[PDB]
Design an enzyme around this catalytic site. Sequence first.
Site, PDB file in Angstrom:
ATOM      1  N   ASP A 194     -41.885  24.056  37.978  1.00 44.19           N
ATOM      2  CA  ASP A 194     -40.536  24.166  37.753  1.00 44.19           C
ATOM      3  C   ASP A 194     -40.104  24.023  36.068  1.00 44.19           C
ATOM      4  O   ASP A 194     -40.372  23.031  35.478  1.00 44.19           O
ATOM      5  CB  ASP A 194     -40.075  22.852  38.297  1.00 44.19           C
ATOM      6  CG  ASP A 194     -38.500  22.453  38.223  1.00 44.19           C
ATOM      7  OD1 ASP A 194     -37.728  23.533  38.118  1.00 44.19           O
ATOM      8  OD2 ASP A 194     -37.861  21.274  38.489  1.00 44.19           O
ATOM      9  N   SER A 225     -27.352  35.895  29.006  1.00 46.97           N
ATOM     10  CA  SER A 225     -27.093  36.996  29.752  1.00 46.97           C
ATOM     11  C   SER A 225     -26.004  37.787  29.252  1.00 46.97           C
ATOM     12  O   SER A 225     -24.842  37.125  28.762  1.00 46.97           O
ATOM     13  CB  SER A 225     -27.326  37.051  31.400  1.00 46.97           C
ATOM     14  OG  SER A 225     -27.135  38.310  31.911  1.00 46.97           O
TER      15      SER A 225
END
Length: 330
Positions: free
Chosen positions: A35, A199
Amino acid sequence: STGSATTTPIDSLDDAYITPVQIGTPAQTLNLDFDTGSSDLWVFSSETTASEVDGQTIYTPSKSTTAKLLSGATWSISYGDGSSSSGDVYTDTVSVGGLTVTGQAVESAKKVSSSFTEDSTIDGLLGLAFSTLNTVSPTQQKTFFDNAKASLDSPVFTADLGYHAPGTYNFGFIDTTAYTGSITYTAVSTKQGFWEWTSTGYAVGSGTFKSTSIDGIADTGTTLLYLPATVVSAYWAQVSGAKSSSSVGGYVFPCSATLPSFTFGVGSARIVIPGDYIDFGPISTGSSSCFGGIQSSAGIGINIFGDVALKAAFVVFNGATTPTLGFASK
């Protein structure tokens, strides 16, 4: 040193991925959920409340000659999905894919929430976010990656998750045969303890690319792709009959649909998530309404590039002095 381990979907939907991890002496192999959005290595154990264990493999520290109770240490964690676990702490030898760390904090669960009990395939979590998020008290502990880092050939790990197929976590090296083209690297902020990056935009299907900054986290421990409501609405508007369902808790779509791809930007590069990756199947057995794999982050407070996005890429988690993230097509 290096390590290399195969990671395997837990089910036919890629709801999560498990990776075998050797703990203790002699080794006890548990299948952990790696994770990159948390920083605790915790396991089902011989200390876990018996009624809360249902099929998981447990760590038994009393059977490990290298286990040592970390005196006074406790831990307690709550995850984004509302699940939780807590307990006490041992140090022990932990190996992943041939890479060994001695003195790793292994957090032994005394209590786990129902969602963990109900998932027989996940024996615990191995956190790979920054150690500043580790919950052990009164002395915070380091992640497996942080402990291994100085020994690694290169201070990196890579995630290469499969679509409905196994994939690979590598530590200490970049497998140049595992991706196509070049890896595009992008800046990371560690301010919130995550692999947080920005992004450069998105496209839906064959549509034009929208240049827009989307701050979010690379999170292998989250199944879906969570993005701003504007972006998610633009995606699902291209699917006839798709709608956000308050009763189901997100976007659903007719199972008869063919889903468009979704592209996200990494600098000037582009990662394309095929439409099929966005299908999470019937909302209940036999239903013709299907779960969408792209959902709004509006109720979260952060955008999350979870498995739906990451599995479309070869992803480098670069733990150099200034961390960065790399993405390549594959």
